[PDB]
Design a binder for this molecule. Sequence first.
Ligand SMILES: *[C@@H]1O[C@H](CO)[C@@H](O)[C@H](O)[C@H]1NC(C)=O
Ligand SMILES: *[C@@H]1O[C@H](CO)[C@@H](O)[C@H](O)[C@H]1NC(C)=O
Lengths: 13, 189, 177
Amino acid sequence: GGYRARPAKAAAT
Amino acid sequence: DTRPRFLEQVKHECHFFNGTERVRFLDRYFYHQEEYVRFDSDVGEYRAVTELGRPDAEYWNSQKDLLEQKRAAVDTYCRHNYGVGESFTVQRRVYPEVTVYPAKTQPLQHHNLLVCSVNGFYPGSIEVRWFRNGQEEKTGVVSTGLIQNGDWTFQTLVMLETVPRSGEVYTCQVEHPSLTSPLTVEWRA
Amino acid sequence: EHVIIQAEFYLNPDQSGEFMFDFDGDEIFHVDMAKKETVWRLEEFGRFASFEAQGALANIAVDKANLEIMTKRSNYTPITNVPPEVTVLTNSPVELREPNVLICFIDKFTPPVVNVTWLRNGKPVTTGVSETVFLPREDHLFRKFHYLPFLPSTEDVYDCRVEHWGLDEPLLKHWEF
Ligand SMILES: *[C@@H]1O[C@H](CO)[C@@H](O)[C@H](O)[C@H]1NC(C)=O
Ligand SMILES: *[C@@H]1O[C@H](CO)[C@@H](O)[C@H](O)[C@H]1NC(C)=O
């Protein structure tokens, strides 16, 4: 099977 | 290089209790060593851990589609990834090779240390006991502790402070999840 | 019972980033950012699982942009150097002429930047050496392993030499038979 990356989130500017 | 450094870290953590029956997911953001904002699946929203993270807590909690991705991560991320690697992580079992050899606390003196060297095992939970003539020796036991070799094996040295006498038989006993019964190695003076 | 961590970082001004998965404190894989490849910690793992390296590259880019934002929020407060503790050990009991491996364990340090040299009788050695990427700790410092396969002889001494911005002098940890 394939590992599935948890996405990063863009910080507030 | 005396230029100042600046570090960002993210850790997306999946905590598993009793297989996948109980799962906790943590989305953690760090500046240098400082966790500033975190999503805890126990809560289901981001929370500022320090004041540095307040902007992100507010901004990210306003994105209901983001919060729903994170609220589902225990299933789509934690449970999924646990399944992908189960055969070579959760079910990884590597037998402990056990070596017993004498040593010295002070060079030029005599052998006064029996070393039980337990090498190459996985996973880390292990119990090592010392016996003399079938009697457990609880005194004079010192150890390296559990050592991670960095290559999916562990080792530990468990040492017995004793002055060996002729006729005495010493036994290192190793219990480990890879074994079905205790493993014993004898040493005679 | 078990913990899996996808651990990432990005460091300025070095512009170095890293992306790895950890299971119970051992590295499952990391992504070589230069080659854009998944590198399995043990080669067997790659025969049972896969990972699309592009997702790591995407996250690192976000991490780079986020570091810029957080640096400003902190008023450009930089990291405090934490120098490493260093231990040298062998992975199995040592017997003359029996091949073995020297392990250099570099622990509890930050930032994740280090120069590590193996020395045999005071000279750098490189044939056969290998190393891990920076591994995460629960206190959000780092640790790292370097390895040197060797043949134990009474004629050789070894040192692991670790350089880090938190150290005044290089740290040398010695091993001999
Ligand atoms: C950065 O400086 C501003 C202005 O003095 C202040 O309001 C803010 O709290 C500071 N941030 C930190 C993390 O020290
Ligand atoms: C590593 O070595 C390079 C070249 O000698 C140097 O520029 C850098 O500052 C060193 N890094 C550390 C952490 O000592």
